[PDB]
Design a protein around this ligand. Structure first.
Ligand code: ATP
Ligand code: MG
Ligand code: MG
Length: 456
């Protein structure tokens, strides 16, 4: 399938035995440790400090798989960065967790960006997106021990971010956290593209969960752009139903719909599913991508698997995988969900360290289904996507990085010796500046000045 998307994960950061240490500082020390604080990677990825958290923004990708690949790559990058921070003269040993909460009452988001037609009514987006985002935590939920933002509430939930959203629509602020974020920063031609900023998702360790999160959403976004959805999935008290779903790991609870019909999160997801199948069949027909049908079947299988038993998905889904780890401890040690150990286990699951990370052990123990190979994940660290402008950005920093004064999604600003003014080549088109467009040019160009000349 093809959708221009990206995943910006704000990594949970902690400094052991460092009450004095500042998040902004620790978050910066790690981002600066990888430099050899906004840093653009050869990956086309972005490393920077955001909200006092180290953040990794994948390069722009055209599919949920590559998004998975370059997000995962970000984990390896975060781990490496944190290790280097300890190697630096500054002694800080920084723990990084890919998670949405520190269980202290603080919540940092894993953002998913999608490129949509600007012509797509935002009202239709909100209408059909809200119900989807509320109920997608079934597979997407990283899982969280403790209920409510404070986490003092005894229990296990699907979503780590669910308790942190008061409002359904609006701009994301420090005080309020909307389900549907109103911020439009396309970083692409504004008339042609709208960048949908999805803040409601939990950062997933599981490659499948991320795949489904991005894939299913991408599907739903397609139907919204084609105005395919006839019905209204809108839910009364979506923000409440959001938490409700998260708060029920059994997924028994049904949402109340403005049409009056009652459906569980999974049933509602199935509604989107068959609608998604019905949409792709109508449009794609036989030409449908393998990945589109893969996301389709994985979405259907998951929802069916979920309905029958959640735990059979323990290899695929974070919240189920974690729940597996958690229920084990509980049965073995007879611990209530109020047990602090369960929270440490919840947190440790997201630990970026290969040895310490519970998800990472599961992967090493073969307890998780991977959608991508570690060999590719490694390459995806220094190597950008070929199908996106990230290629031009990434390759430039690698070869021309020395001559580059600044880079972003919007452009790459070179400094050419002999030119008093900085030369800016904007990457406005996410789909341009790919391996095909700039690939040869970047191979031939001996210098940035030579490259800038070719582009001009
Ligand atoms: N045109 C686009 N369409 C879809 N996704 C995009 C686009 N441009 C960038 N992205 C994605 O957005 C992420 C970069 O987001 P960034 O960390 O800069 O946050 P932001 O969008 O500036 O907002 P904030 O700084 O408030 O989080 C990348 O992971 C990338 O994949
Ligand atoms: Mg960001
Ligand atoms: Mg963001």
């Amino acid at each position: 399938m093809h959708r221009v998307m990206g995943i910006e994960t704000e990594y949970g950061i902690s400094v052991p035995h460092q009450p004095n240490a500042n998040a902004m500082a620790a978050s910066s020390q790690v981002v600066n440790a990888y430099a050899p604080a906004n840093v653009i990677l050869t990956n086309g990825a972005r490393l920077y400090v955001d909200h006092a958290h180290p953040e990794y923004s994948t390069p722009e990708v055209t599919n949920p798989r590559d998004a998975v690949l370059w997000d995962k790559a970000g984990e390896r990058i975060m781990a490496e960065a944190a290790r280097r921070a300890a190697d630096l003269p500054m002694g800080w040993t920084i723990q990084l967790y890919k998670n949405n909460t520190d269980n202290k009452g603080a919540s940092y988001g894993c953002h998913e960006n999608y490129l949509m037609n600007r012509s797509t009514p935002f009202a239709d987006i909100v209408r059909h997106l809200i119900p989807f985002f509320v109920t997608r935590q079934v597979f997407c939920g990283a899982g969280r021990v403790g209920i409510g933002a404070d986490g003092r509430g005894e229990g296990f939930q699907l979503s780590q971010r669910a308790d942190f959203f008061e409002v359904e629509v609006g701009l994301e602020t420090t005080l309020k956290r909307p389900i549907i974020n109103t911020r439009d920063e396309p970083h692409a031609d504004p008339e042609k593209y709208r960048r949908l900023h999805v803040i409601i998702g939990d950062a997933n360790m599981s490659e499948i969960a991320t795949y489904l999160k991005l894939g299913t959403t991408a599907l739903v976004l397609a139907m919204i752009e084609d105005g395919f959805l006839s019905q209204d999935f809108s839910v009364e008290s979506p923000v409440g139903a959001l938490r409700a779903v998260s708060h029920d790991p059994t997924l028994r609870y049904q949402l109340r719909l403005h049409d009056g019909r009652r459906l569980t999160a999974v049933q509602l997801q199935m509604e989107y599913l068959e609608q998604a199948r019905k949409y792709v069949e109508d449009r794609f027909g036989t030409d449908v991508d393998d990945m589109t049908r893969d996301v389709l079947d994985r979405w259907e299988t998951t929802l069916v698997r979920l309905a029958d038993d959640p735990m059979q998905l323990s290899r695929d889904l974070d919240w189920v995988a974690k729940l597996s780890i958690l229920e084990g401890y509980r049965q073995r040690e007879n611990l209530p969900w109020s047990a602090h150990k369960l929270q440490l286990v919840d947190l440790q699951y997201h630990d970026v360290r290969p040895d310490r990370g519970l998800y990472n052990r599961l992967v090493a123990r073969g307890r998780m289904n991977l959608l991508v190979d570690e060999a590719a994940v490694r390459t995806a660290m220094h190597e950008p996507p070929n199908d996106t402008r990230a290629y031009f950005r990434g390759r430039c920093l690698a070869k021309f990085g020395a001559e580059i004064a600044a880079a972003s999604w919007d452009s790459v600003i070179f400094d050419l010796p002999g030119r008093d003014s900085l030369q800016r080549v904007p990457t406005l088109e996410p789909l341009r500046g790919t391996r095909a467009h700039v690939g040869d040019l970047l191979d031939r160009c001996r210098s940035a000045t030579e490259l800038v000349a070719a582009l001009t």
